[PDB]
Amino acid sequence: DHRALDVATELAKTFRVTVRERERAGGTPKAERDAIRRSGLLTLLISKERGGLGESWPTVYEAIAEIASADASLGHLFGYHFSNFAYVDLFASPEQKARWYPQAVRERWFLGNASSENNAHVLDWRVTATPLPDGSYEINGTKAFCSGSADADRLLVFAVTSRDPNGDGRIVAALIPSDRAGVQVNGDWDSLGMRQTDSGSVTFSGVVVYPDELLGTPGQVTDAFASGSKPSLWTPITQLIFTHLYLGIARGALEEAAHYSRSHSRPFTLAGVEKATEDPYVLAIYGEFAAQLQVAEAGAREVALRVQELWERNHVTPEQRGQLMVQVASAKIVATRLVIELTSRLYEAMGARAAASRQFGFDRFWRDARTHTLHDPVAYKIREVGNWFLNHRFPTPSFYS
Amino acid sequence: EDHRALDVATELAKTFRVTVRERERAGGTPKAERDAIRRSGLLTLLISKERGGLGESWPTVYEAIAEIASADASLGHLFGYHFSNFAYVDLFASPEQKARWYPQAVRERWFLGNASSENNAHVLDWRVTATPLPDGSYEINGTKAFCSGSADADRLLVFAVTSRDPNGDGRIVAALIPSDRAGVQVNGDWDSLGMRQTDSGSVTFSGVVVYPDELLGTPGQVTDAFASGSKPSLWTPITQLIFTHLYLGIARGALEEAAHYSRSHSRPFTLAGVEKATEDPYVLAIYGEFAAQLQVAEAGAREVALRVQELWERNHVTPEQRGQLMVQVASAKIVATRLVIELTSRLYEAMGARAAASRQFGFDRFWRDARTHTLHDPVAYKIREVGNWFLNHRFPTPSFYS
Amino acid sequence: DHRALDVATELAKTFRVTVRERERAGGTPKAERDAIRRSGLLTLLISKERGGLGESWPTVYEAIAEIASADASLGHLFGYHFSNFAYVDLFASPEQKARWYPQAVRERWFLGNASSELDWRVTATPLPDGSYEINGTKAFCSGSADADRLLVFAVTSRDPNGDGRIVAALIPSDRAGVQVNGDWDSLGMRQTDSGSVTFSGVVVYPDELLGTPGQVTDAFASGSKPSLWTPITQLIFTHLYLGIARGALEEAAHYSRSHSRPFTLAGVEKATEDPYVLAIYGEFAAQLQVAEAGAREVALRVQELWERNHVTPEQRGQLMVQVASAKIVATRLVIELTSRLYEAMGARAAASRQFGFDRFWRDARTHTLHDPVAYKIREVGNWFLNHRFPTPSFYS
Amino acid sequence: DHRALDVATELAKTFRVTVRERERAGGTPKAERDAIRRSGLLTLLISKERGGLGESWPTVYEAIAEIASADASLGHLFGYHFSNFAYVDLFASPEQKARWYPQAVRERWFLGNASSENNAHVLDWRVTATPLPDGSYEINGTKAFCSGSADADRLLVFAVTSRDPNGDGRIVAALIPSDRAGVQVNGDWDSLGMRQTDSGSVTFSGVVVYPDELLGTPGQVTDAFASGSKPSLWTPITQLIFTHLYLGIARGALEEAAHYSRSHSRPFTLAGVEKATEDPYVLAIYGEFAAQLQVAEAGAREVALRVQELWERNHVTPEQRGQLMVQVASAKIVATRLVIELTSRLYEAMGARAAASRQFGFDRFWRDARTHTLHDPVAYKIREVGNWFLNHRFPTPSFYS
Ligand SMILES: c1ccc2[nH]ccc2c1
Ligand SMILES: c1ccc2[nH]ccc2c1
Ligand SMILES: c1ccc2[nH]ccc2c1
Ligand SMILES: c1ccc2[nH]ccc2c1
DSSP: OOHHHHHHHHHHHHHHHHHHHHHHHOSSHHHHHHHHHHHHHTTTTGGGGTOOOOOOOHHHHHHHHHHHHHHHHHHHHHHHHHHHHHHHHOOOOHHHHHHHHHHHHTOOOEEEESSSSSSSSSOSSSSSEEOOOGEEEEEEESSSSSSSSSSSSSEEEEEEEEEEEEESSSSEHHHHOTTTHHHHHOOOOBBOOOOOOOOOOOOEEEEEOOOOOOGSSSSHHHHHHTTTTTGGGGGHHHHHHHHHHHHHHHHHHHHHHHHHHHOOOOGGGGTOSSSSGGGGHHHHHHHHHHHHHHHHHHHHHHHHHHHHHHHHHHHHHHHHHHHHHHHHHHHHHHHHHHHHHHHTTHHHHHTTHHHHHHHGHHHHHHHHHHHHHTTTTTHHHHHHHHHHHOOOOOOSSSSSO | OOHHHHHHHHHHHHHHHHEEEEHHOSOOOOHHHHHHHHHHHHTTSSSHHHHOOOOOOHHHHHHHHHHHHHHHHHHHHHHHHHHHHHHHHHHOOOOHHHHHEEEEEEEETOOOOEEEEEOOOOOOOOSEEEOOOTTTTTEEEESSSTTTTTTOSEEEEEEEOOOTTOOOOTTTEEEEEESSTTTTTEEOOOBOSSSSSSSOOEEEEEEEEEEEGGGSSSSHHHHHHHTOOOOGGGGHHHHHHHHHHHHHHHHHHHHHHHHHHHHHSSOOOOOGOOOOGGGOOOHHHHHHHHHHHHHHHHHHHHHHHHHHHHHHHHHHOOOOHHHHHHHHHHHHHHHHHHHHHHHHHHHHHHHOOOOOOHHOOOHHHHHHHHHHTTTSOOHHHHHHHHHHHHHHHOOOOOSSOO | OOOOHHHHHHHHHHHHHHHHHHHHHHHOOOHHHHHHHHHHHHGTTGGGGGGOOOOHHHHHHHHHHHHHOOOOHHHHHHHHHHHHHHHHHSSSHHHHHHHHHHHHHHHHOEEEOOOOOOOOOOOOOOOTTEEEEEEEEESOTTTTTTEEEEEEEEEEEEEOTTOEEEEEEEEETTTEEEEEEEOOSSSSSSSOOOOOEEEEEEEEEGGGGGGSTHHHHHHHTOOOOGGGHHHHHHHHHHHHHHHHHHHHHHEEEHHHHHHHHTTSSSEEEEEEEOHHHEEEEEEEEHHHHHHHHHHHHHHHHHHHHHHHHHOHHHHHHHHHHHHHHHHHHHHHHHHHHHHHHHHHHHHHHHHHHOOOHHHHHHHEEEEEESSHHHHHHHHHHHHHOOOOOOOOOOOO | OOHHHHHHHHHHHHHHHHHHHHHOOSSOHHHHHHHHHHGGGGGSSSGOOOOTTTHHHHHHHHHHHHHHHHHHHHHHHHHEEEEEEHHHHHEEEEEEHHHHHHHHHHTTEEEEEEOOOOSSSSSGGGGGEEGGGOOOOOEEESSSTTTTTTTTTTEEEEEESSSSSSSOOOOOEEEETTTTTTEOOOOOOOSSSOOOOOOOEEEEEEEEEEEGGGGEEEEEEEHHHHOGGGGGGHHHHHHHHHHHHHHHHHHHHHHHHHHHHHHOOOOOTTSSSOGGGGGHHHHHHHHHHHHHHHHHHHHHHHHHHHHHHHHHSOOOOOOOOOOHHHHHHHHHHHHHHHHHHHHHHHHHHHHHHHHHHHOOOOOHHHHHHHHHHTTTOHHHHHHHHHHHHHHHOOOOOOSSO
């Protein structure tokens, strides 16, 4: 059954036609986000019983890579939607799922994030939740890197409790409308790459969050991650989403370069080459990177299958979660090194005119990859894999590991 | 999910690790270990159960090769090459030949040797000639180099070029013959940097008669299969993926052995402000970089191995199927080659000076083994082949190396 | 005597203030080119006897790198000026130089190129009085805007004495028939005005010609002193790449000191104490130190041979090998450093497009493609393995 | 004069003839050490007035690299002799120089080390110096990695004071005869590479050190290093010696590979080239490594000239010493990466037969380089250069930085 993947492939084809012009402007790719809404793919992981497609994580990951190969910003938005959905599904109550999931199908929800990317200790988080009557909370503060925060049907929001008789310093998460009073999407995203992901800041001014919007009790995510209960799959799932962004960009860059080489590169006739496509060093560049891409992609498919396997389990052991996170981290490390090298070095196969003509726009691939690969430092993913291999220590679960 | 065969290979590898350091110094023929492999039954992994074999798959074979190679690269090589030789026989032998040979191979515990599918020369430049005799036999003459596993071999897979042949000179003939056939001399002239117990020296054929029931196909049939990209040309991707698993196995064995050394000799650098080398950020980074690359390379290799099995089971294979497989194998080999050559050298940086000051530690065996065999055929042309496919949509030209 | 270098350092300091906004616009950095004119440094290699500074190639190369570290386009324009000057000096007669060089000092000449860079089809048709008419369109004409003179190359055509012979001339950029097309819109090197120039019936007078037709080809085939132009110019490129590398490293370090946060899971209090941040700076700073030190030695050898009356193909070939080696190392270094330093700075260095650090990669990524480093590598390999010096050309 | 370098070149040629058989056996290369004695080059830095050659550090460094290119163990021994000589010369009194230097010419001293390479805090040093009457000290203990300790005419020895009314924990350095009673060279060097450097352990049993053998007063080296006086040049001098071992090994390996390639120019059967010396990928391997070698050697010559410049100064500032040490560390880092990569990857240019015949012996270059590059961890030389560049901190003078 390749129906969903065919739909994603067709979306990506349409995105390729316009990405060069669209991403220069930045801003919100509303038309393309609506095209994704109409495709139904946002419901890939919602059961057929609840109106979704009843598909699997391997399909999601392949769709993410395909879309990202055409437009990295749309790939990012699409993949982040599923990271946000994964968080919801891992913490939501039975009655929340019975209400939200049919509604997400009917209303074609595209989920945004504000924000699960807090590069700081919990007591230093920008956004605080203070109690209101009847179990509600009030959210205040400004957070940056709110991925996909424009045109979002719901925002997955995070805050730390304050002035709370039931405990200060606890992480609360909630899924709220983006037009709730006091939510201000600031529109300040102007980035090197990932230019159409609307990953700017969001300011919360006295924003009300109701109990039926809270995703577990305050502090539950800390307990679930540290214990290795099922929600501890969120981070390997999400880090593998990022991995598929990088592999998608890598494949799109390699295929765009090859098209240029076949139609535009002149041979270095000084060295007796009649066609650039027959040049031994041009061929070596393509071979080195296509070979690494093939292996990285084949490996990523295996880890995606393991995500699905553990996703279906009722309980996951620390060894099972830790081995998965190590495999994901390994795939991310290899994909990061590959995409960053490839998107820069492929110019050496294409020649000077590929850079002399700014309009060719090939630098988009490097810009997009160079931007998002910094989400969290690959040096610490490397350290995490090393600490496991040498010392048998699995990574400490967190929002980044 | 039958893990019995892989358990047997794991136990074999365990025993080999105990003695490999002393054995590989001596070189020569690891007869005791070859006999342990014979007793294990694993040489029959790919023979059908109907013919007395284990009826297992290429994924199992490849995993077993990597496991054994991680303990002893020469024994992994010998074991892997046995299946390369077996694959050639299976792809070219008649059903009648197989009906006789495979039960015999099970009963007599055959360990196959090679003499030799590694020529590195145009057919006209081959040293070993096959002169036709009136009954359809061929007389073989010449000295063949790089005859891997040629010592203690129950049968040799032999290649020669026709000479003085009214039906055409320069055609490749292949046969499977006893190693004690009159005129066969295994020369034992192997004294190498690494892969020191693979007996990859020369074999001299002096008037060796190979009989018609030992010939594999007709003269030149392997060249025709290569030109067609047909199923018998699967021999090369199968064999190149065997090599890939030797390199992944050596890499895994090296990384684990290094980790063991680091944990038990964890003296930190004075100025480094570390209490333990196992907490040093730069030691951890070396292990992490190489372990990550190893995980991805291994996971990728498993996928290519499943595809080998799929096409192995087909009655017919198209050049497009064969070419895509060869590109995928070449890609895996390229990554595995770069990985094992970098890792076996750079892990010293994580272990520290005493790992090299003590020759007896013997860790350089991993680099020596990998550095030797990765030269079998130049990785630069595997890279060119993948690039020519990706850029120009040209599949590699089938050959004994591509 | 560091007076010239001090002038270059102060110019570079001024250029840093404005480069971020200027290079976005592209186009011609007229004000900064005029600052270079006022500095006198365009006359670095002209003898004091002819009104110049009487300085050495080592000083020129250090000034190029310094300016390039601040503004790669201005570094390129400045460096190319000296490539153009080197060509004039190697081929012009003493009588021509006695006129041109004091004029270049008085009129503050900034030389442009059209063009030093396979098969050339801009033609030079001989006229009876020794003049030529130039026709055709050149590409990649670096510094062709606001140029006091253009160094122009063409091949003879309709020539009873032999078609296809290369002629070179130094002509005013506003001579009738010269059209600078203004079509440069590039990834990096955005203010180098390296677009196309169209020649329509452009007259070249005999006293503007540099040597005789085909003389440059003869000099390449002989490996004689004028063939030094290529190693001189390839080492100019090398110093652009080393300068960009140093500028990028320093800009990154400033960001790391003033803006980088420690990764929350690092267990370190300051990003400047993070072991992996320190390893990135150390690995690239170390390579830069060795590359810069080696480049200084090769620059001294350029000067030594520049002063010789005659140069052998063995002297020229050995120098070219050393220049190629430096260029290879500098190319790899600058391309890796300008991309990887983001990993020492963090996500916010890319999240804020206005920071503009990608300029370094864009500039280096653009100009390092001038000629393929793969063939510089092959040339060094062919020398080391087969004892064959590079075949002299406009690229080797 | 190029006399000394001609002498070194001729020595190196002789060593190449026998290095394969000698390094396999290990042990002491006595005949070759005596050849170095006959050459006079051990006296390169002794003034002509004291009987030496009156030469300079740039000459010494070139000679080290030339000899190392032929035989890394002899290059190491020769280089370490000059590290030992530098230490002596930086601390010896006028009386000691007047006595020792003519004696070193006449007796042809080849200096050994036992040992300036203590990977441990001063208080934790293996070897102690306890006061004796009349200003003598008694040395007791075992130190490992005593480079060139066999057939050494004098040993440079280091110990820490104890039971010393004038201060415990102070570093004493002395130059003593190797046949002084109580000195036991243990002969336990059996290494991967550098196999003929006799870098095993030395045991001191009640060894007497007289006042006229002491190199300064106890603790003077620590004062000199901390102050940046002239003896603080010892570490950059010595680390640049190691750098020249690595560049020498690199050049020797590259030249040996090229000779093999030229005399075994068998092209790969399917390469489509007539000869391996015309293969594009063979040429790329030689070009990449030859290019890096040219730049590293040129940079090393510049740093050697700076060593000589500061060597002649009466005073060196902490900035001058720190800048030199940064330049030396940078050279050592680059040379380490280059030699380790080159000595392994050049097999790819030569082909399978270069490894199939162990007797070819090319692996000696990798084994020698792989062994000595671990002397002190390159990761911390990298950190030191990074700490300088990013934080403007020069390395703290020590025996390793
Ligand atoms: C680094 C770069 C871009 C990004 N968009 C959302 C997160 C994030 C992190
Ligand atoms: C080619 C290259 C290296 C080798 N080691 C054992 C066999 C063999 C063949
Ligand atoms: C001028 C400026 C940039 C360039 N890139 C390649 C050539 C070239 C010339
Ligand atoms: C002398 C010889 C070889 C060595 N390896 C590490 C240190 C050291 C010292």
